[PDB]
Design a protein around this ligand. Structure first.
Ligand SMILES: Nc1ncnc2c1ncn2[C@@H]1O[C@H](COP(=O)(O)O)[C@@H](O)[C@H]1O
Ligand SMILES: Nc1ncnc2c1ncn2[C@@H]1O[C@H](COP(=O)(O)O)[C@@H](O)[C@H]1O
Ligand SMILES: Nc1ncnc2c1ncn2[C@@H]1O[C@H](COP(=O)(O)O)[C@@H](O)[C@H]1O
Ligand SMILES: Nc1ncnc2c1ncn2[C@@H]1O[C@H](COP(=O)(O)O)[C@@H](O)[C@H]1O
Ligand SMILES: O=C([O-])C(=O)[O-]
Ligand SMILES: O=C([O-])C(=O)[O-]
Ligand SMILES: O=C([O-])C(=O)[O-]
Ligand SMILES: O=C([O-])C(=O)[O-]
Ligand SMILES: [Cl-]
Ligand SMILES: [Cl-]
Ligand SMILES: [Cl-]
Ligand SMILES: [Cl-]
Lengths: 427, 427, 427, 427
């Protein structure tokens, strides 16, 4: 997953940054105790200045201590003088590990939120730039009635707007800390320590907690980040569908898939969209794992920790990369407006049959009289390969021909587009 | 799943009720068109009065029509006179199927919401009724420090309060209708029809839609209802853990598992909690299915419909039954307050070691001097089977014995309970 | 799931049939004990003759007994005289429930195995009937080189042949019984009882067991039945792809989707394939549930039982219906051999570029000289809309034109078909 | 996942080793063509000697080529002279990528197979070393009847023996190659090339293939490797259950969890087992992803490739580490034989009630007379806290007391152990 990681998200999930987050939690812990008259401020001002993380040293110590917080606590302590004594004062491993983890998630969520807002903009501009670009609506892969590429982009815009709303919400659920002690009873640690750290780390407090944060928070979070990935797959599948050789209504404007410098000009592949699809299949795996991490035993068990070492970075790193790669795909996406408008007539004008029927009935004609002077001619249009108009024009529906144009006009279906865009927040 | 269905939820997912929901949508559709001057109101007032659903008749017609909305449309039409003509006027199958489905979900969500609020009350009363009931906090299945059964119930209370909040939110996402036509372009159906129906059905409108509602709504909904099921499993696993023979700290007060009328008095099983666990394993299955229903093709494809015929009833029926069965389990749950307080001393008072250490250091003693007059005696307490006090009392820690009571007092750990309950909204 | 159930599989999962399976297990249990001189044979010959199941009576008794085996045991006992006493002699609930469940699975597996062999035949005949039917191979949805519809059906044939092989194997894993007593120690029940029943029920014995069969058996079984469902989805997605309006290379020969008796002749939908896709999304859900049923506690816990009440019938009923509906779809599937052969030339003969290149180099020409008298003309073929031949024919590649036919001949790609069919076991 | 990776498996999934596997495939490809008289052997003997992989160079070239096989092909080519020309002769990207991937899996499967056989040995020795170690069988977490720790280890031994059998099978499904060309038609590449490479790489041939291997192979493989992970979780959950403070029947002999050098001797945690549980939650995620990779489009689509870049290494690396860490846990696992035998009497001898009942009836006594001189005394044993014997001895069941020893003897339940071990293949 170094091939599928952008730099900013990748750095967040390094050991450097996890230990630095433990340090901040620890130091802030001492600042909290100090306001409560347990530790002299001078000693804490010393700690902030002299404390340095060393990933290699901590990991040397970890092979003997067999415990990762103890190792960290010892490492930092080797960079300090006497103020060593206050490092981790009246705290338990997971008061740090878990408050710090929520902090790092807050950092990851800052990125993903920006990715989401960017993608929403890309979708807003694509929508407006193809507002009236007629193409075929398709149901079961079959031509039904026309629509516009702009409307399809508006469909996506509002989906993402739903997905952002969600994500914003789950952030308040997940960016939450805990410093409630060995069993969540605040027995040997007042709640004002938690209150202090979490305010300064810019996160909230779990009102009631165990040794660890409650994992229904994490699970919904994964659920959410997976929903975003799934709808990215939806969009990617659209592009894949529309880039098919027989359609050619859009094209990933990357030139990828070959043929640019070769003699195979037809090889225009949606491999980026295929990529996004496959990453989506991974993000969704961790729905299982995140959900199975909820039934921890009693106050705590640590099984969730090994699983979320792999899942939390993977899922945020994958999601960050998918959001941006597909934001680019969509931005650069090449839309063939003429191929779209051409494909409207692959069904020989049979999509405008109900309109010719209606046009006859709304002209003094009987509900069945009009039906028998359309249906048989409509049939022959499909069986032979000739326009639906040319067969209608032969029979006496003439005396009208001045406005069969209106029945066969796909621009009829644009009549509510301005409202669809208003509804979507794109006016 | 007739063994795991309560009556009110079961009736919602019958064919009677689905067709009745199609009828209401249809009739309301005609009321909408009528205000728009397409249909005479008299004909619609006729329709409401004369239209009757017949599940057997519709299904007879369906074996030849091979289409379920057409079948319905024909059935109702046989119960009407001339006003037949306006049934389904200017509508497409899925404008009804899907607006009606969202309506039936609204009905299911009314039940589940009530189940959630009831369970929250059961948890509020259990919390207050055991606010100060000392038991052992357990980490990795091992004794750590004391806590109270009331606090554990408060932990659950706030989880559910999170889960309700979620559920309330997703309801606004899911209880949403659509009457936007064959491809979501409003081309041949003004949006004021959708607006009319959905207001009268008490649901909202999808701003931009395809032939069908967008399935990220459904998926998050399932996600959510599965999270609630997973945390029910969490709680059920707690009960299972605590009802183990070696613990006996709680007991499903059902008398189930045998021994009441037999000569096997020790067989007190948590089979209800085991049941809830197993249903939870089913609800979570449909996370997959709901998520894989999102990548529909273009304007629509119908694959989601076969999957949500089974999933939507199953998941709501299962969840309704799990919420209520476990609400009862918890309400009736028998708590052995004495067994809890006894088990605190299965570790021979070794849980109060840090407090004796502290008590010595906070009395003029050196940080290490106090450590060497606890640790070796603490060790011998575990290896032999004798109280930690009796070995401390032999050595000159005397000159104090008047308040070793305070070090060995588990009621120390109650000092923040009143605040934990205040935080949880149970003051 | 009454809409998605065939009759034979549906009957297997009724209460009638589960109780009848408990009866047989019980009776056979008594026949076993009898050979071991615990029960007189006359009493057992009585039992077989007089014992009748009554689903309504058992369920009446179950509302007070609160236990389903006890209820059954009491019901049957009301249909017997004195020989009542031997019903369930020296047995525990789950020795019956679970040996009987494996038996009912054996019955379900008889159906599915037949469904699989039928589908394999349908695929063998489709393969042979289109052995040489040229169509376009497609990669990333884009034209690559030709293939034949027969070869594509052979691809499916061998997949299913893999899937049958698997299924055959997992049957030996799952069609396995247990009568080892309360904790699997054979303490109060010799193994020759288990041996007797299981031989007569036509199933094997779990060498070492707990109170219950070990659920890794069930999980692999579900895994398997889900793999079969997933590859059915694969095939269904192919059909869906190929039935798209722009392709029209195949068509579900059902006439479903409308237009037969209407004036919308273009509405030829693959709704059956869409259906199979959606059922597939359900079968895969129960991968989760089956796998989470493996970590039972100690000798047993009953959580697996509530989950497999719903899963085992659902998954077998769904899979039986999907196998047969799609076997029919494929059998009746209408293949448009001319549309296939036409679509080969939608890329204007650009798929035969490497062959013209090769044909020049394999004629005294330089590896690059031939490349510059193809590539630029190939490019112009795609940009304009004119055959690749017509632009090649203008330049002096003439002096040859007698066998540009061989370069542009798609029948080149049939040269190994007879071997592909031999490899697949279709010669 | 560098914290959860052993070295041998980790090296297999490096870029060095993937490119080296591409090289071997390529070179072998040239050896195949050479036997077929397309390439001079001297040129291929040159290629084998001069071709060197360079991971950094290939990745430099990949940022411009935007294609990873082309990049590789160019890199190796820079290490060769004129024999460059034959590198990748008449092959397509995925003939190499995918034949090579199957090869690397073969390598991974060599490791996992060894891990499985080692774990099976560890389980065989544990079984024999505790063959007769009496402990309580537990159902619903409650005492039922005795069993032995040896029998429980035999239960695990046979499970793993099932899991190995499976794994052996799926290896033949997965360790399979493909060199069938752009669309699997062998059109421009005889099957004897595939035959040649795959024989020399020690893998089999896919009889019918597309551009890529068919992903039902991979999915079953993941399914399988996840089943093994799930049963590891089962075992780990057992250990976790049994190491609980109230039980203390086993203990991870690592000394991990603290208290060795501290004054908290009761902190004996099963954190290794907790770890294995959490990794298991990850391996199972990729059931989803592997299964969703099966519906590729037509001849191929590349979405499976991004997902199996992450999944295939992760799942094999995780599984290798879980198998070995838990093999060690089990080997070193400390069994408290005395605590086991003590816990048998936590139910006050009530587990031997049916045996006292039987002992009275099998002595001239009536089926009900014996029931009323046990049940009421059994009840009082549980309500008070006094042995079941002491209350039986007060009533005239005397005139017998010489062999109440036989009724209350747990060594009764060992009577079939020698057969359970024979059944399991441990005699
Ligand atoms: N009660 C506990 N709270 C926090 N960390 C712990 C606890 N017990 C052990 N650990 C350590 O935390 C790490 C967990 O490992 P892992 O399962 O790989 O995340 C190991 O270094 C453990 O020794
Ligand atoms: N475009 C469509 N919109 C709504 N329903 C349809 C459409 N096409 C077919 N149907 C019918 O809806 C039902 C879908 O079946 P199922 O897949 O079992 O939910 C069948 O009766 C189909 O004939
Ligand atoms: N140890 C046991 N073995 C078999 N069945 C049991 C056991 N304990 C309870 N049962 C009953 O089996 C059924 C399990 O219910 P369910 O969870 O719905 O499958 C109920 O009727 C239980 O009372
Ligand atoms: N038809 C194809 N066969 C094999 N590889 C391809 C094909 N098309 C593109 N690729 C390349 O294979 C890699 C796939 O990327 P990923 O999705 O990250 O595995 C990229 O370098 C693609 O450019
Ligand atoms: O050692 C500790 O404090 C822990 O594990 O929480
Ligand atoms: O027939 C219809 O209207 C449909 O299928 O939507
Ligand atoms: O009552 C029984 O025998 C049981 O539950 O197994
Ligand atoms: O370029 C190629 O050969 C490919 O992508 O398969
Ligand atoms: Cl929390
Ligand atoms: Cl929507
Ligand atoms: Cl078994
Ligand atoms: Cl294959």
């Amino acid at each position: 997953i170094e091939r599928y990681s952008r730099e900013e998200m990748s750095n967040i999930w390094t050991d450097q940054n996890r230990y630095e987050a433990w340090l901040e939690v620890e130091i802030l812990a001492c600042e909290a105790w100090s306001e409560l008259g347990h530790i002299p401020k001078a000693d804490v001002q010393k700690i902030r200045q002299n404390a340095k993380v060393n990933v290699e040293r901590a990991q040397e110590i970890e092979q003997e201590t067999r415990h990762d917080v103890v190792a960290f606590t010892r490492q930092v302590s080797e960079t300090l003088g006497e103020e060593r004594k206050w490092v981790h004062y009246g705290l338990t491993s997971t008061d740090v590990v878990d408050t710090a983890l929520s902090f790092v998630i807050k950092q990851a969520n800052d990125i993903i939120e920006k990715d989401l807002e960017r993608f929403i903009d890309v979708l807003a501009e694509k929508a407006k730039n193809y507002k009236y670009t007629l193409m075929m609506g398709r149901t079961h892969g079959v031509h039904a009635e026309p629509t516009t590429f702009g409307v399809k982009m508006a469909l996506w815009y509002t989906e993402m707007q739903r997905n952002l709303q969600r994500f914003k919400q789950v952030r308040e659920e997940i960016e939450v800390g805990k410093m409630s002690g060995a069993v969540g009873t605040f027995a040997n640690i007042p709640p004002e320590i938690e209150s202090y750290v979490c305010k300064h780390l810019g996160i909230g407090t779990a009102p009631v907690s165990t040794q660890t944060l409650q994992r229904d928070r994490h699970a919904y979070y994964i659920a959410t980040l997976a929903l975003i990935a799934t709808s990215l797959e939806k969009f990617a599948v659209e592009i894949r569908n529309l880039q098919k050789t027989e359609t050619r209504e859009v094209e990933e404007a990357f030139a990828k898939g070959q043929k640019g410098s070769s003699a195979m000009p037809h090889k225009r592949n949606p491999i980026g969209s295929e990529n996004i699809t496959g990453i989506s299949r991974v993000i969704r795996g961790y729905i299982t794992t995140a959900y199975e991490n909820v039934p921890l035993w009693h106050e705590r068990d640590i099984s969730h920790s090994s699983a979320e070492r792999i899942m939390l970075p993977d899922v945020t790193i994958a999601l960050d990369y998918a959001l941006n790669r597909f934001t680019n795909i969509v931005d650069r996406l090449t839309v063939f407006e003429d191929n779209m408008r051409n494909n409207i007539d692959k069904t020989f004008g049979l999509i405008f049959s109900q309109r010719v029927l209606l046009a006859l009935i709304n002209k003094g004609m009987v509900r069945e009289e009009a039906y028998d002077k359309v249906q048989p001619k409509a049939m022959i249009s499909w069986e032979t390969k000739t326009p639906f108009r040319e067969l209608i024009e032969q029979d006496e529906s003439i005396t009208t021909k001045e406005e069969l144009d209106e029945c066969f006009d796909p621009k009829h279906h644009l009549n509510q587009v301005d409202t669809i865009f208003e509804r979507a927040g794109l006016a």
